[PDB]
Amino acid sequence: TTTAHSDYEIILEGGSSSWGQVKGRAKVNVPAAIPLLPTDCNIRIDAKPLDAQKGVVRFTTKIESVVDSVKNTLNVEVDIANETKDRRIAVGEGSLSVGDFSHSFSFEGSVVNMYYYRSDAVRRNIPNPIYMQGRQFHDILMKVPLDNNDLVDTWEGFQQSISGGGANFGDWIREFWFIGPAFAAINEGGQRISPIVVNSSNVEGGKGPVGVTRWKFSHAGSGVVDSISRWTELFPVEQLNKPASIEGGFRSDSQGIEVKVDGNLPGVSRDAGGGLRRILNHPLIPLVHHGMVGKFNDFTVDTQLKIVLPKGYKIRYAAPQFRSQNLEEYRWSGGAYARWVEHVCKGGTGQFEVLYAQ
Amino acid sequence: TTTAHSDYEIILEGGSSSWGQVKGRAKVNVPAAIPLLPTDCNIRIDAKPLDAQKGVVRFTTKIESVVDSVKNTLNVEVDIANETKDRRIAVGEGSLSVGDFSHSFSFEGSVVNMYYYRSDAVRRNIPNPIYMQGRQFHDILMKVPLDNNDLVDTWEGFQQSISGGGANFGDWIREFWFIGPAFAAINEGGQRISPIVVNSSNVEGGKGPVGVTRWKFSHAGSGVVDSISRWTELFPVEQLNKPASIEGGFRSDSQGIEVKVDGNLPGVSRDAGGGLRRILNHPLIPLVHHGMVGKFNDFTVDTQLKIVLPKGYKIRYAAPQFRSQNLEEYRWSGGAYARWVEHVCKGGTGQFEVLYAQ
Amino acid sequence: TTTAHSDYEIILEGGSSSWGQVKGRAKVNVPAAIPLLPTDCNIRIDAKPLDAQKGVVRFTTKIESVVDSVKNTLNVEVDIANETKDRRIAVGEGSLSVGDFSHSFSFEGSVVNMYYYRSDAVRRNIPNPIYMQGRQFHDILMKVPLDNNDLVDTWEGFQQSISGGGANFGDWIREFWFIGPAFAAINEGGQRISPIVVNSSNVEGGKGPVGVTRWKFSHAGSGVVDSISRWTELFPVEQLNKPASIEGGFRSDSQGIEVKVDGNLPGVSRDAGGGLRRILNHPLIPLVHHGMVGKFNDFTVDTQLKIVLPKGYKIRYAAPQFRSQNLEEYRWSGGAYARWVEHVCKGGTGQFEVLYAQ
Ligand code: BCL
Ligand code: BCL
Ligand code: BCL
Ligand code: BCL
Ligand code: BCL
Ligand code: BCL
Ligand SMILES: [N+]
Ligand code: NA
Ligand code: NA
Ligand code: NA
């Protein structure tokens, strides 16, 4: 049979905390859609508060992949802080490698989230808003040491293209940037990527010569794009009073996919009003984008979810309904929950709400 | 099992009439894709000829919905008339409500449909044309009393945005306008929405102050967009010699969908040439847009269609073929018809033609 | 049951040849998605080297279709040659017919393929690259005798549109050009079509008057578009030391689809490095575009592939693995291969690699 086997667990903190431990595991005997297989990847993301800096988070991520035998890596360390509810700043550094090749980088930037035409008439009438339309402006200064011949060559290639290419450069860069199926995924999610505008390009010297570029773009969304709709929520700095982490890994080939995720992080629950809390609303881009790959083989669901509430708390509402309960432990499987799992794995965004209370 | 149960019925008028009674009912035990559930909605649309006005139709629609407990309404009454085969005019008024908030509006406008590069070489050779490419130009004057503080606030927000925003305003408005999954659906159907151009914005006074805007946009299609391809057909004013109506309602949540539609209206059949008539060609946007939600759960079809021809008329051709017949009554179920139902519910546009004759 | 029955065979040439014989057959009892049925079509494509012209290929194609009873044809004969690895030239002529109407044409043009930002850092590290982003510039001079009244009329319609329409003409032409579902398919594949620019329009005289237009456009891809990513590979002129041909035909209606393809052509295998060869990487646009129709009915796979290697060669790697082997003959069916067939018929691009060696 083609059967998708999966297991998910959430363990929630109580009191004023929004933290939870999250676990997910899945195995399915279908090919992945990658046109190079096997393809394997591990990612780790960490965040900790910085001791001597009020509201600043040290965020790091490490990616390792193997694609048709070729080993790749990316490492990034970044300090991130809000300036206002709309404006966030970042400064960081990192490196990447592909086979025998590597390069490093450093950057700083500002991102301004701008909702379109928000109103109190909406706010006071919609208890759990989902789609929030907006545009999010990036301003980036980046630096790369030109410390091998390929880097020199690519710098020169870009300088000629920018010099010669007027508006075309920043227009046509989008199908370079969003390689492969990434480009189609933009519109799928009601997202838009603006042209790039290059403000300046300079070689400094570092050490050695460094290619320095100041550039800008914006992206927009009609409300599915969670990076815009949930801009403040997705950076839960006030809850980060200790280190948070998540890691995920998958292995895939032309006969199967297997994946594991483990994390401990703020923002797993959220205040729902009225003395209630919910599991955070499911982000929509993961569902819509995974929907672009989840429809290629028929499958049966073999899936269980366990949610462990904080001590003494109880479920107030869940739909699909839990299958069973004992004290803080609630379990879902089969029936309507299994049809919901099938639905979201194929791209559906139907709501599975879980509300609970002290 | 996941089974979709549905039943459809058509009862046709004869002679020179294109009218039919239409009924549809469906129930399916799958979640809807709305990210807020339950979501319920009723719509009623009515059209009647105006006694003292040659070719003018009074068109009304009333929508009531509940989305995550929040009650919404829209009411619109409009007088619509053709000026030429390409140009139609409208004047109307209405109101909307969301929870505790409401506002009213009035408007007038003109819409010009423009096919691209039509030719007699096509006309005389294609017996049943489907894809007709074109662009459809809207010119709108609308008025809203600014009779609560939220309306004042939003007026001021837009005035600043238009003043300050040059071309960006009318560009970026599109992802505000086509909220949520609406934006992606545009391209899915081979449709295009132009930027908005604002011709003027003025507060009048009403009564009290009224926000008045004159603005324009066009939309285009490659031939799937029925609002363009079938522009004259979709407003069957000459057949409307008595009131027409249709109503539909659905209830949905994370475990099921149920829907009912009932109507009596012109345009259910159409002259096919040669002394023949057909059930009107299936519009394609409903199929393509519903295709964006119909692929998220496997289902079995349990579906019957009944078509009742006018007295003495008989089917000349149907594919998929009817299952059974008795006098004017033809029934479809099972076999090829059921595979067609599955197909169109998932987004397929394959032709199911029904031709009949006196 | 809904069952897709299909059979594929590849017979490879050895030595320095990349040629293979290809056969495919399929039958499936589902409706096609065409909104006019039945629809049938045959295509034949032929290529031969020109005796007195070094590197020039005479390429011909003939299409015959019937769509809702209407017979159509297209015939084109073209001489094609590379000037450089990036620039190709063409000169040709042909005719088309629809029912009682026909017209002829002649043309010449140049096409320049331009990859974006290629690098040796990529080249030396990726053994089998797939996604190659780029833009491909067409420059076309075409001539049509205005030798019937419809041609005169359409010429005049276009002259007025171009004269009057500024940038809109070359913008809005895209939804005329990519009729029906073609328009949506562009973005689906990460493809872009630029506006048209018209350089000139003139009536010559021919004979009689001839409408002559010089015009340009580019298309681009993020790497899925094989016409860009595999620009040199897709025109295997150096291997064409004798005539090549392929033919395909299908019949479809609201109850089934049947198709047959037969060809003998260069480029079926390719050097994989290291003394190895592979079956050419599967082109991605056919899979992505067919994916737009392959998801509308559940189906079971009944499918066999046979690959016959050149004498003495053996498979070095295949995933999904072959089912059985005897001497040069390898067969796939069932199991993982059948899940791969289902996957690619629905739009999946997962890699099925076949490597072999002398
Ligand atoms: C620069 C990146 C941005 C950022 C962008 C986003 C975006 C965008 C989203 C979030 C989302 C979340 N973020 Mg944030 N986030 C940042 C910083 C943080 C910090 C911090 C204090 O620094 C914290 C603690 C969080 C915490 C959170 C949670 C509130 C939420 C995920 C909930 C969950 O259960 O996930 C459980 C996790 C899983 C089930 C799967 C995890 C899979 C792997 C291990 C990680 C994701 C990989 C992703 C699919 C692919 C990345 C591709 C890149 C090319 C590398 N983010 C910075 C500022 N964050 C999501 C959300 O729901 O927001 C409302 C979301 O959509
Ligand atoms: C294909 C399956 C679906 C999916 C199916 C489900 C199901 C089913 C359930 C949840 C549930 C939850 N999911 Mg979800 N979910 C997906 C993706 C995400 C992402 C994300 C950033 O991608 C986020 C933040 C969330 C967040 C959430 C919470 C709202 C909630 C509780 C956590 C949980 O049980 O996780 C479980 C963990 C997973 C499902 C693992 C998902 C991992 C995804 C696919 C990303 C892997 C990235 C990979 C390792 C690295 C990529 C690197 C790049 C290639 C460079 N999901 C994918 C796309 N999710 C539960 C819920 O609603 O509780 C109320 C629930 O029952
Ligand atoms: C301002 C709106 C436009 C208009 C736009 C359209 C569009 C667009 C289409 C039609 C279509 C039709 N219209 Mg018209 N139509 C108008 C005025 C009229 C008047 C009239 C004399 O005033 C009449 C009698 C009709 C009659 C008809 C039929 C010829 C045809 C539907 C056939 C059928 O069997 O439906 C049976 C109905 C059903 C199976 C389902 C009905 C569902 C519910 C009850 C109504 C539709 C809701 C829709 C899905 C969502 C609307 C969302 C909005 C945000 C509110 N229209 C005005 C001028 N009409 C369709 C067609 O096929 O044209 C060729 C079509 O695509
Ligand atoms: C998901 C199912 C498919 C669908 C499946 C079928 C099937 C199967 C058959 C038809 C048939 C017909 N359909 Mg259809 N059809 C759909 C949508 C439409 C729409 C439309 C405006 O949406 C129109 C005008 C038509 C028109 C037609 C006629 C050509 C024909 C005879 C009427 C009939 O039997 O209706 C039956 C009525 C329905 C199927 C109900 C459809 C209601 C749709 C989904 C809209 C509901 C709107 C909701 C109530 C309100 C939305 C409000 C907004 C959220 C604000 N269909 C949807 C998208 N249709 C029959 C035929 O071809 O006869 C020859 C036939 O056998
Ligand atoms: C003007 C057209 C272009 C061109 C554009 C393309 C494009 C684009 C592609 C190819 C591809 C291929 N081309 Mg080339 N090709 C041209 C000239 C040639 C000549 C020659 C010496 O003149 C030769 C021998 C080839 C040979 C080849 C093969 C290397 C490869 C197909 C492999 C296979 O097994 O197919 C076996 C075939 C089948 C399984 C199915 C065949 C179906 C039918 C009979 C033909 C295709 C119809 C297509 C779906 C629809 C066309 C619609 C039009 C509106 C008419 N091409 C010219 C220069 N060629 C493909 C590839 O993989 O490249 C890497 C590809 O994507
Ligand atoms: C829906 C089914 C899928 C598909 C499923 C498979 C499967 C399954 C297998 C291959 C395999 C192969 N396919 Mg494939 N393949 C498709 C389309 C293509 C096209 C193309 C130009 O459309 C090309 C060049 C190829 C090329 C290739 C080679 C890489 C490989 C060996 C040839 C073979 O066995 O062909 C077999 C022939 C076919 C599948 C026939 C495909 C015909 C397509 C649908 C086009 C028909 C055009 C029609 C006749 C005319 C249209 C005219 C217009 C309407 C005007 N495929 C379609 C879209 N292909 C085999 C492989 O990977 O070996 C290692 C293998 O096992
Ligand atoms: N899609
Ligand atoms: Na390096
Ligand atoms: Na009010
Ligand atoms: Na002719």
CB contact under 8 A, B180 and A340: no
SS3 category, A149: helix
Considering only CA atoms, which of C316, C345, C350, C323 is closest in space to residue C6? Answer: C345
| Burial per residue of B37-51, b for 16 or more beta-carbon CB atoms within 10 angstroms, e otherwise | bbbbbebbbbbebee
| Burial per residue of C232-255, b for 16 or more beta-carbon CB atoms within 10 angstroms, e otherwise | eeebbbebbeeebebebebbbbbb
Nearest atom in ligand 6 to the alpha carbon of residue C63 is 55
CB contact under 8 A, A35 and C349: yes
For B133, which residue in chain C has the nearest alpha carbon? C176
Gap between the Cα atoms of A273 and A276, Å rounded: 6
Cβ neighbors of A30 (< 8 A, separation 6 or more) are A2, A256, A257, A296, A297, A299, C339, C343
SS3 category, B91: strand
Strand blocks (E) in chain B: 3-12, 20-28, 39-49, 57-67, 70-82, 87-98, 101-115, 134-145, 191-193, 197-204, 210-221, 244-252, 257-265, 269-273, 276-279, 300-308, 314-319, 324-326, 329-333, 353-357
CB contact under 8 A, A339 and B30: yes
Query: Residue B290, annotated ligand binder?
Result: yes
SS3 category, C157: helix
Mutual orientation of helices A149-164 and A166-177 as an angle, nearest 10°?
Answer: 130
| CB C248 within 8 Å of CB C42 | yes
Q: Which two tokens stand for residue B207?
A: 């009564």
Preferred mutation among B118, B222, B228, B341 to probe C, highest tally of C CBs within 10 A: B222
The residues after which chain A has a C–N gap greater than 2.5 Å are 205, 206
Residue with tokens 């819509």: A288
Ligand 3 close to Cβ of residue B43 (< 6 A): yes
CB contact under 8 A, B31 and A223: no
How remote is the CA of residue A103 from the centroid of ligand 8, in Å? 4
Element (H, E) at B289: helix B284-291
Q: A77 phi and psi, to 5 degrees? A: -125, 130
Considering only CA atoms, which of A112, A102, A107, A106 is closest in space to residue A82? Answer: A112
Helix boundaries (H) for chain C: 120-123, 149-164, 166-177, 182-188, 226-229, 284-291, 335-345
How remote is the CA of residue C354 from the centroid of ligand 3, in Å? 53
Half-sphere exposure of C59 toward its Cβ, with a 13 Å CA cutoff? 16
Q: Please, which residues bridge with residue C93 across strands?
A: C77, C106
Ligand 5 close to Cβ of residue C182 (< 6 A): no
Using DSSP bridges, classify how beta strands B353-357 and B314-319 pair: parallel, antiparallel or unpaired: antiparallel
Query: Residue A282, annotated ligand binder?
Result: yes
Residues tagged in the binding site annotation of C for bacteriochlorophyll a: 103, 138, 282, 289-290
Gap between the Cα atoms of C146 and C212, Å rounded: 10
| Burial per residue of C81-109, b for 16 or more beta-carbon CB atoms within 10 angstroms, e otherwise | bbeeebebebebebeebbeebebbbbbbb
SS3 category, C8: strand
Residue with tokens 């070689």: A203
Considering only CA atoms, which of B60, B213, B217 is closest in space to residue B143? Answer: B213
| CB B255 within 8 Å of CB A319 | yes
Gap between the Cα atoms of B227 and B288, Å rounded: 14
Distances (CA, A) of B178 to A7, B70, C57, C295: 36, 21, 49, 26
CB contact under 8 A, A190 and B181: yes
Gap between the Cα atoms of B175 and C161, Å rounded: 30
Cβ neighbors of B51 (< 8 A, separation 6 or more) are none
SS3 category, A47: strand
Element (H, E) at B229: helix B226-229
Considering only CA atoms, which of B321, B324, B347 is closest in space to residue B336? Answer: B321
Resolution expressed in Å: 1.3
Query: Residue A290, annotated ligand binder?
Result: yes
Contacts of C281 in chain A (CB under 8 A): 35
Half-sphere exposure of A288 toward its Cβ, with a 13 Å CA cutoff? 23
How remote is the CA of residue C222 from the centroid of ligand 2, in Å? 27
Q: Name every protein residue with a CB atom under 6 angstroms from any ligand 4 atom.
A: B 8, 10, 22, 24, 41, 43, 63, 248-250, 259, 261, 279-280, 282-283, 286-287, 290, 305, 341, 344-345, 352, 354
Gap between the Cα atoms of A57 and B243, Å rounded: 66
Gap between the Cα atoms of A298 and B298, Å rounded: 8
Mutual orientation of helices B149-164 and B166-177 as an angle, nearest 10°?
Answer: 130
Cβ neighbors of C84 (< 8 A, separation 6 or more) are none
Considering only CA atoms, which of B357, B271, B280, B276 is closest in space to residue B312? Answer: B357
Nearest atom in ligand 6 to the alpha carbon of residue C261 is 40
Distances (CA, A) of A77 to A83, A103, C350: 19, 15, 33
| CB C278 within 8 Å of CB C354 | yes
Residue with tokens 């006074």: B205
DSSP per-residue codes, C40-89? EEEEEEEEEE-TTSTT-EEEEEEEEEEETTEEEEEEEEEEEEESSSSEEE
Residue with tokens 């701008």: A114
Contacts of B35 in chain A (CB under 8 A): 130-131, 281-282, 284, 349-351
Using DSSP bridges, classify how beta strands A300-308 and A3-12 pair: parallel, antiparallel or unpaired: parallel
How remote is the CA of residue C151 from the centroid of ligand 10, in Å? 9
Residue nearest to atom 3 of ligand 1 (CA): A235
Q: What is the CA radius of gyration of chain B?
A: 22
Considering only CA atoms, which of A187, A197, A234 is closest in space to residue A218? Answer: A197
Contacts of B36 in chain A (CB under 8 A): 128, 130, 351
Query: Ramachandran region of residue A6, left (φ > 0), alpha (ψ -120 to 50) or beta?
Result: beta
| CB C175 within 8 Å of CB B114 | no
Residue with tokens 């063409």: C90
Contacts of C343 in chain A (CB under 8 A): 30-31, 33, 296-297
Gap between the Cα atoms of C228 and C234, Å rounded: 9
Element (H, E) at B164: helix B149-164
Chain B closest-CA separation from residue A336 CA (Å):
6
How remote is the CA of residue C234 from the centroid of ligand 5, in Å? 6
Q: What is the CA radius of gyration of chain A?
A: 22
Mutual orientation of helices C149-164 and C166-177 as an angle, nearest 10°?
Answer: 130
Nearest by CB: A125 against B37, B100, B298: B100
CB contact under 8 A, B150 and A342: no
Gap between the Cα atoms of A115 and A125, Å rounded: 18
Cβ neighbors of C210 (< 8 A, separation 6 or more) are C143, C144, C145, C146, C203, C204
Question: What's the length of chain A?
Answer: 358
Distances (CA, A) of A343 to A282, A291, C298: 13, 9, 16
Gap between the Cα atoms of B200 and A354, Å rounded: 48
Q: Which two tokens stand for residue B272?
A: 């096919």
Helix boundaries (H) for chain A: 120-123, 149-164, 166-177, 182-188, 226-229, 284-291, 335-345
**A243 preceded by cis ω (within 30°)?**
no
Strand blocks (E) in B1-86: 3-12, 20-28, 39-49, 57-67, 70-82
Ligand 5 close to Cβ of residue C57 (< 6 A): yes
CB contact under 8 A, C122 and A98: yes
For C220, which residue in chain A has the nearest alpha carbon? A175
For A162, which residue in chain C has the nearest alpha carbon? C117
How many domains does one find in chain C? 1
Distances (CA, A) of A15 to A276, A277, A354, C265: 12, 11, 18, 71
Gap between the Cα atoms of C177 and C160, Å rounded: 18
Residue with tokens 């053996």: C314
Amino acid code (one letter) for C346: K
Gap between the Cα atoms of C209 and A273, Å rounded: 76
CB contact under 8 A, B98 and A117: no
| CB B55 within 8 Å of CB B239 | no
Gap between the Cα atoms of B143 and B4, Å rounded: 44
Strand blocks (E) in chain A: 3-12, 20-28, 39-49, 57-67, 70-82, 87-98, 101-115, 134-145, 191-193, 197-204, 210-221, 244-252, 257-265, 269-273, 276-279, 300-308, 314-319, 324-326, 329-333, 353-357
Q: B26 phi and psi, to 5 degrees? A: -150, 150
The ligand with the least distance to the CA atom of A225 is 1
Q: Please, which residues bridge with residue C107 across strands?
A: C92, C142
For C189, which residue in chain A has the nearest alpha carbon? A184
Q: Which two tokens stand for residue B85?
A: 């085969």
Gap between the Cα atoms of B191 and B182, Å rounded: 12
Cβ neighbors of C40 (< 8 A, separation 6 or more) are C65, C66, C249, C250, C251, C252
SS3 category, A338: helix
Q: C142 phi and psi, to 5 degrees? A: -130, 155
Gap between the Cα atoms of C217 and C137, Å rounded: 6
Supply the range of the domain harboring residue A330: 1-358
Q: A327 phi and psi, to 5 degrees? A: 55, -130
Gap between the Cα atoms of A236 and A256, Å rounded: 35
Question: What's the length of chain B?
Answer: 358
Ligand 5 close to Cβ of residue C315 (< 6 A): no
Q: How far is CA A56 from the centre of its chain?
A: 20
The ligand with the least distance to the CA atom of B185 is 7
Considering only CA atoms, which of C193, C222, C226 is closest in space to residue C117? Answer: C222
Gap between the Cα atoms of A183 and A177, Å rounded: 8
DSSP character for B239? G
SS3 category, B338: helix
Nearest by CB: C31 against B189, B192, B340: B340
- Residue B53 sits in a domain whose CATH number is 2.50.10.10
Q: How was this structure determined?
A: X-ray
CB contact under 8 A, B100 and A220: no
Gap between the Cα atoms of C76 and C104, Å rounded: 10
Question: What's the length of chain C?
Answer: 358
Gap between the Cα atoms of B159 and B262, Å rounded: 43
